[PDB]
Copies of this chain bind each other. A is one copy, B any other.
Amino acid sequence: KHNMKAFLDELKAENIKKFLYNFTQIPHLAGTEQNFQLAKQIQSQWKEFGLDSVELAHYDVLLSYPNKTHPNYISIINEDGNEIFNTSLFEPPPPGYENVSDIVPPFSAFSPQGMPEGDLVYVNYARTEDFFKLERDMKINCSGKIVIARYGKVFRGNKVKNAQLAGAKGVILYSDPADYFAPGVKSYPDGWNLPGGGVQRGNILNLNGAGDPLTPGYPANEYAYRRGIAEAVGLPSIPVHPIGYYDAQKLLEKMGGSAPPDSSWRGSLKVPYNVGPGFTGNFSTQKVKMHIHSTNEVTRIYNVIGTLRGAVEPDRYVILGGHRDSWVFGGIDPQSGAAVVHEIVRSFGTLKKEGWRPRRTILFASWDAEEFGLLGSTEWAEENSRLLQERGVAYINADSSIEGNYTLRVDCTPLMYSLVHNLTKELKSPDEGFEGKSLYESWTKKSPSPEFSGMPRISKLGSGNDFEVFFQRLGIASGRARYTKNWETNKGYPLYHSVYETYELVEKFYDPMFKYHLTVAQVRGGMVFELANSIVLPFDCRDYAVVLRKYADKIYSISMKHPQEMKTYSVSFDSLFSAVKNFTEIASKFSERLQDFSNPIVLRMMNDQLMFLERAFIDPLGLPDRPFYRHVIYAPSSHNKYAGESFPGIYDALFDIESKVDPSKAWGEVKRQIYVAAFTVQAAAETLSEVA
C-alpha cells in the first residue's frame, strides 16, 4: 500500500547523515559561487529523486559583505590615537578546517561604513526595557555614545533599531558566556560550547516583512525598478560589529560610570558590568574606535523549486520550504533542516516512481539568502503571490532540525494543532526512557502545555524565518517543528552562526544516531503528507476559536491595567468578545457540517472554506506602518522579530501608553484597533457560515 506509513518508513537516518555531511564541507554563503553550485546539485538530485519539474528561480537582491582587503575591527585608542588593543580579524578555525578558503569573517550584514570613536555605554540585551531602564530610571544618555550589547533574548535587528533610536553612533554586539556557555560543558571542539574567540554572524535589518530592501512589494527580477540606497527598507544608519567574549572582556573590564542596576544586567565575565558611559579613572581618556568597511551590493540569488503534481487537486499547493544559504558551514543552521527536506523529497519520489501521486500538489523549496533577511522566499512569494493567495493550502518550514536533543518543539497556526497531535501519537519517541512510547507521550511529558492537562506545548509562530511571507503577509496556514533543549535547566544553541557550527558538532554532540533528525523528518514529512493527501483538509477551525478567546482575555487584561483611562475614553472590548463568541458558535456548526456530508463540489467548497480561513485574518491595509504584516491575529513582536505577538494591532496601541503625550489620541487608536480586530474576527467567522 501507498499510504503515510509507506512514506514514513522510507525515510532513513543514514541518508539524512550522508546529506548533512555533503552539505557542510564548504561554506555556502548567499550570493557566492559555492552556493550557486549547491543550488545546481540540489536541482539535479531532486530531478533524479523523481519530481515532475525542478527549476531555479533567481533574483538580484541587496546583500552585504566585508571588504577582503580592508578588514573590520574594533580598537581601544589611547589619548594619542594609538590603537592599544584590537578585536580579532577572524575566528580561529576548528581542527582540520584551518586551510578551508572563503570563511567569511565575523561581521554584521548591512552595517554602513564608518569609523566612529567614542565612550562606551553597556546596554545589557539592548531590549526596549533595557533602554527604558537606562534613559528613564538611570538618566543615562546614549546620544553620541558607542553602545555595547550582549546577544540574546531578542532579534539582533531590534537591538540595533533600539540603539539607533536612543542616539547611539555605533553598536558592538558580543556573546556573553552567561547566554552562550552552558555550565559543565566544554568549548568546541571538545564540547558544544562557544569558545572565547567564537563570534555570531547575522544581519541587523529591520525589514518588517519587506524582503529585498530595494524592491518592496515586487520581485527583484531582471527589469525591476530599484529604490536608491537612501530609500531602501530596513538598513541601519550606524555601524555595527559582533565580537566574542575574550574581546568583549577587554572592552568591558575598564568601564566606569554607574554600576549595573541589578543582577539581571550582569553576565558571567569577571567584570563589573558597569553601564558607563566611558572607562574608570586611569583610562578615562581612552576611547573605543570601530572600523567598518563592509559594502552592500546587488547580487544574484537562486531558489530551487521542485514540483510534485497532485493527482486530483493539482491547483492546491502544500509547500515544504527551508533555506540553503549559511553564514559558514551551516552544520545546524540550515543544513540539518535541508538534509531532512532532501530525504523527504527522496521518499516522496520513491512512492511516485511506483505510480503514486499525492492528491494535492506538493512544492519543495530550497531558499537562498534567508540569512540576509528572508530574501529568497519573500521575492519568490512576491512574484507568485496571486497563485499562492488562491491555491496555497499550507506552508511547512524546514530550517534547523535540531537546537538541542531533549524534546519536540512545534510552532504553528491553531489550524494545525489537531493534525500535529494526531500525527505525533502515531510516531515513535526517539528519547531515552521512552522506548516503545509515542512522540506525543514523550513530548507531552517533557513539554506540558501550560493551560491543558495531558497536551503538549505548541507555540504561536513568531518570525525570523522563511514562513514569514507565507503566514503574516499572505495568510497561508503555516507550521514548523524541530528538536529543542530543556528550557528549565538551561536559559538558542551556543555555536549559532559561528565557524564552529560544523558537521562534527552535530555528529559528535547533538545527534550521533541521527534519530532526532529522523523524528523531525517524520513530523515535517508526515504533516506535508496529510496536508497533501487527506480528502478533507486536516484543519480544525474550532482550535482557532479556543485561542482567539485566550488572546482576547489577554489583551483585555493588558488594557485593564488602566481602568481610569478606559472609563474616560469609553474603551470597550465588548465587540471583540462578541466576534470571538460568534466565531466559536459558527466554527462549531461548520465542524458539524464537515462531519455530515463523495459529492466532490460540496467537498471542494468545504475544503476552500478550510483553506481560506487563515486567509480571512489578512487585512489588506496591513498593520500601522508595517504594510507587509497583514495578519490581524499574529505579527512578529515590534520589540523582537523572533517572538509572535497576538492581536498585535491592539498590543502595540496599548504598549507604554501611559507615556504618550496625548492620551486622548492614544486611547482613540486603541479603540480603532479593537474595532479592526473585532471586525476581522467576525469576517473570518462568516467565511465558515453556509455560503448561500
**How many of chain A's residues have a CB under 8 angstroms from any CB in B?**
53
Name the residue on B nearest A228 (C-beta).
Answer: B668
- Known A-B contacts A383-B683, A386-B684, A601-B604; the reply to A691 vs B315 at CB < 8 A is yes
A679 close to B608 (CB less than 8 A):
no
State which of B217, B310, B675, B687 has its C-beta within 8 Å of the C-beta of A386. B687
Closest to A609 in B: B315
When distances are taken between beta carbons in the complex, the residues of chain B under 8 Å from A586 are none
Q: Report yes or no: B601 in contact with A387, Cβ–Cβ below 8 A.
A: no
- Whether B616 lies near A627 (C-beta < 8 A) is no
Contact yes or no, A225 B672, CB < 8 A: yes
Q: Which of A52, A225, A361 has the most CB of B within 10 A?
A: A225
Contacts of A621 in B (CB 8 A): 217, 627
Shortest beta-carbon distance from A311 to chain B in Å = 10
- Residue interface mask A670-683, B partner, CB < 8 A = 1: 01101110110001
CA distance A616 to B385 in the complex (A): 9
Are B575 and A615 in contact, CB atoms less than 8 angstroms apart?
no
Is residue A350 within 8 Å, beta carbon to beta carbon, of the partner chain? no
B residues near A386, Cβ cutoff 8 Å: 612, 615-616, 683-684, 686-687
Q: Is A24's beta carbon under 8 Å from chain B? A: no
From B224, B601, B676, give the contact of A218 (CB < 8 A): B676
Residue of B217, B317, B679, B691 touching A314 (CB-CB under 8 A): B691
Say yes or no: is A4 at the interface (Cβ < 8 Å to chain B): no
Pairwise interchain contact B223-A310, C-beta atoms closer than 8 A: no
Q: Which residue of B lies closest to A674 (CB)?
A: B225
Contacts of A257-271 to chain B: CB distance below 8 A = none
Do the beta carbons of A225 and B315 come within 8 Å of each other? Answer: no
* Residues of chain B contacted by A224 (CB below 8 angstroms): 675, 679
A157: min CB distance to chain B, Å = 23
Judging by beta carbons under 8 Å apart, are B691 and A312 in contact?
no
A150 on the interface (CB 8 Å rule)?
A: no
Per a CB cutoff under 8 Å, which of B217, B313, B608, B620 touches A315?
B608
* Copies of this chain, tallied across the complex: 2
Contact indicator A390/B225 (Cβ below 8 Å): no
CB-defined interface of A290-318 with B at 8 Å, one 1/0 digit per residue? Answer: 00000000000000000101101111010
Report the Cα distance A361→B692, complex, angstroms: 7
In the complex, A605 has a CB within 8 A of chain B: yes
CB of A391 closer than 8 Å to a CB of B: yes
**A312 interface neighbour in B217, B601, B612, B686, Cβ under 8 Å:** B601
A588 at the interface (CB under 8 A from B): no
In the bound complex, CA of A621 to CA of B619 (Å): 12
Contact A675 B223, CB 8 Å, known A309-B692, A691-B314: yes
Bound together, the chains give a CA A451 to CA B264 distance in angstroms of 77
Instruction: Tell me if A219 is interfacial: C-beta within 8 Å of chain B.
Output: yes
Q: Is the CB of B675 within 8 A of A225?
A: yes
Given known contacts A309-B692, A620-B620, A605 and B315 CB-to-CB distance under 8 angstroms: yes
Determine the residue in chain B with the shortest Cβ distance to A603: B601
Q: Is the beta-carbon distance between B604 and A687 smaller than 8 angstroms?
A: no
Residue with the highest number of chain B CB atoms closer than 10 Å, among A385, A619, A621, A676: A621
Q: List 11 A-B contacts (CB under 8 A).
A: A307-B692, A317-B692, A361-B691, A361-B692, A385-B620, A387-B687, A390-B390, A390-B612, A600-B601, A604-B604, A620-B620
